[PDB]
């Protein structure tokens, strides 16, 4: 059996793919799988057969995942594939997983790999939610012919529930406390399954059985290992990959509001704060400083779950993440005082947290003067650091941050500059919403009839700010408004040119090499041009938000500046208000579901439906 398996698998996989009838290839694979499963499921079957068969099945499933995705008068592509056949193969796979005692861990590892692949077969290719996808009114999302992928996901969840809590409990325990490889693969399997799980049965089983609390508690058993990885020569990289799979699983459950709530009730922020590994910033195999950056990326990445459908109900989460920032104020300041894309994304998420979390309304209720003074000193540090970001991003240092990466400006570099711009935006817009909230909630100190204006470096104990910074920000944002708008129009033109390429262009790009295959050449070119569509639509959303923010900020600023005695616009207004509105005008959108339509709770719900139609 060893020999047979090895031979067949190796040949099929390595042989140059001259398999003309890929349909017949798939049929052969299916037949083989079925035969193997039928033979091994016997009660009297030998245990030696198990391991060989399991590996062979895993290999075949990987082949099917590669083959089915390659496969994905118009009824000849899926005809011989078989959805009920996927279900029968899935049922045999699951049964063969159950029949495996704990002794054959490697068999269950290979089968969890096979199941991960069979799941990614049915994953819809992630389509970028371009600005244009908000034009499909909810009615066209409700009255369109069903997506077979979703029906298959529903059937797969019903099957997963058929084996009940037994299969889920077993795989969950083996993911929690197995071995190096098995833990990684099973954790990733949990990630994928809870990604597809809409009724959230798997997550409820994870919470009620206490497996989630184990996964979170296991993060504490890392302070001793990770401190050893900051030695230039780490012994093994497997722990890193298990940690990455674990943080991936934790990030997947955080996207769901109920998952974030159950993660807060488990005190994930509590355990994350007690970690000392975030404070060991190395002084400037991956590099040790890169290793600490990585260790930082999961932590803050998950901690920013609160930004998800964790609504104002998850406001205590603001206090928890504030405490997480404060318990490591040294590293936080060393980061905010350090020009990279990673650093800019860190600053963006950090300022988002600070804006949503550092409300003085949290202060007076934490008094159940020590904490008040602590968090006031923290707010002061934040106000001084977010003001120091205008002289780095709003002065002549802008061209030096944009030209030093011009030594190597590929598509990677172009997207990196787009991300630098979104970081500038994100951090400023978030702090500007924070200042607008501090001005609205306080009604900006009407008692400031006390003269606001006079009648004319490491973070120290105390340092005073300026207000001409507001005027400098005004001028710099007025100029960056023009620059970002012009860059936006050019990007839109580039997108229109990419669109003008029809299948006639597929024939015109294949006409030069027809006597990488030209068909797969256009496959890869569609990959590259769709990445271009992604980048360009991201830039569109960015520049639209840029214009909106600059506009509202300066509008209120000049509204205020009017009374206080202060002693190319027509083209930019033309490109923003008229152009983008009427162009992006599904404004006053769908009125069919709303035509078919207990008041207060539902009206706040259809407004939540109106936001989804925007997104």
């Amino acid at each position: 059996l060893e020999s047979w398996r090895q031979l067949v698998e190796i040949i099929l996989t390595a042989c140059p793919q001259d398999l003309i009838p890929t349909e017949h290839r798939q049929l052969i694979i299916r037949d083989l799988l079925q035969d193997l499963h039928v033979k091994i499921l016997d009660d009297d079957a030998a245990q030696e057969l198990m391991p060989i068969v399991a590996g062979a099945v895993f290999t075949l499933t990987a082949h099917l995942s590669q083959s089915v995705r390659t496969e994905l008068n118009i009824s000849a592509g899926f005809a011989s594939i078989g959805d009920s056949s996927l279900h029968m193969i899935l049922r045999n796979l699951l049964e063969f997983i159950l029949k495996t005692g704990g002794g054959f861990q490697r068999v269950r590892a290979h089968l969890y790999g096979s199941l991960l692949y069979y799941l990614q077969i049915a994953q819809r290719p992630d389509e970028p939610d371009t600005l244009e996808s908000a034009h499909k009114s909810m009615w066209e999302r409700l009255t369109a012919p069903e997506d077979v992928f979703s029906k298959l996901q529903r059937d797969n969840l019903s099957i997963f529930e058929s084996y009940g809590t037994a299969l889920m409990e077993v795989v969950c325990r083996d993911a929690c406390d197995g071995h190096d490889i098995g833990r990684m693969l099973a954790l990733a399997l949990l990630d994928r399954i809870v990604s597809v799980d809409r009724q959230q049965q798997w997550l409820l089983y994870l919470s009620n059985s206490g497996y989630l609390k184990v996964l979170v508690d296991s993060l504490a058993e890392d302070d001793v290992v990770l401190r050893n990885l900051l030695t230039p020569q780490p012994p093994l990289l497997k722990a890193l990959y298990i940690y990455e799979s674990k943080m991936a699983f934790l990030t997947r459950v955080a996207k769901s509001s109920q998952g974030a709530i159950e993660l807060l009730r488990s005190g994930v922020i509590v355990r994350l704060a007690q970690c000392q590994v975030y404070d060991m910033r190395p002084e400037t195999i991956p590099a040790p400083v890169e290793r600490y950056r990585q260790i930082l990326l999961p932590a803050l990445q998950i901690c920013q779950l609160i930004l998800t459908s964790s609504t104002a109900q998850h406001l205590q989460a603001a206090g928890q993440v504030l405490q997480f920032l404060v318990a490591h104020s040294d590293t936080i300041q060393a980061i905010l005082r350090s020009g990279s894309l990673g650093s800019l994304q860190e600053l963006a998420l950090l300022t988002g947290i600070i804006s949503k979390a550092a409300l003085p309304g949290v202060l007076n209720e934490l008094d159940i003067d020590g904490s008040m003074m602590e968090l006031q000193g923290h707010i002061g540090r934040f106000q001084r650091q977010c003001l120091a970001l205008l002289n780095r991003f709003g002065g002549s240092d802008r061209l030096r941050q944009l030209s030093l990466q011009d030594d190597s400006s590929r598509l990677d570099g172009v997207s990196k500059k787009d991300d630098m711009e979104l970081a500038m935006q994100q951090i400023c817009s978030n702090v500007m919403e924070y200042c607008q909230a501090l001005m609205i909630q306080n009604s900006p100190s009407f008692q400031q009839t006390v003269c606001l204006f006079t009648p004319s470096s490491i973070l120290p104990s105390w340092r005073l700010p300026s207000l001409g910074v507001v005027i400098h920000l005004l001028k710099q944002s007025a100029n960056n408004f023009f620059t970002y708008y012009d860059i936006h129009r050019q990007s839109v033109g580039k997108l229109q040119n990419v669109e003008q390429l029809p299948p006639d262009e597929i024939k015109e790009l294949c006409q030069s090499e027809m006597p990488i295959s030209t068909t797969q050449k256009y496959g890869l070119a569609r990959r590259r041009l769709v990445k271009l569509i992604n980048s360009r639509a991201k830039l569109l959303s960015l520049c639209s938000y840029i214009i909106e923010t600059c506009l509202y900020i300066l509008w209120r600023h000049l509204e205020y500046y009017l009374l206080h005695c202060t002693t190319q616009q027509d083209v930019d207004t033309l490109l923003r208000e008229g152009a983008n509105s009427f162009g992006e005008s599904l404004q006053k959108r769908l009125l069919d579901i709303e035509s078919l339509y207990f008041i207060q709770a539902l009206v706040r719900r259809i407004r939540g439906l109106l936001r989804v139609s925007r997104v």
Binding site: I269, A327, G370
Partner: protein, 81 residues
Amino acid sequence: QTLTEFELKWQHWREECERHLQNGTFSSNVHMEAVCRVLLGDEEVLLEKRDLMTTWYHFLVSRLLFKHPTVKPTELHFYAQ
């Protein structure tokens, strides 16, 4: 409630008690003053009333309560000695 939060809240209450004591709030009654000194964690008054804490371990636990509520398992030996 995280360990850091708990510790800082405890420290503020300790400061409150200290302030009260420095103001001679309980000067009239020696007993209340002694109780507040115990709240602060003064080991002198703790040892004066060792009749109540008949054993050494009781003394240790009282000290931990009024000095280091957040005590690591590793530090237990030193404090015990």
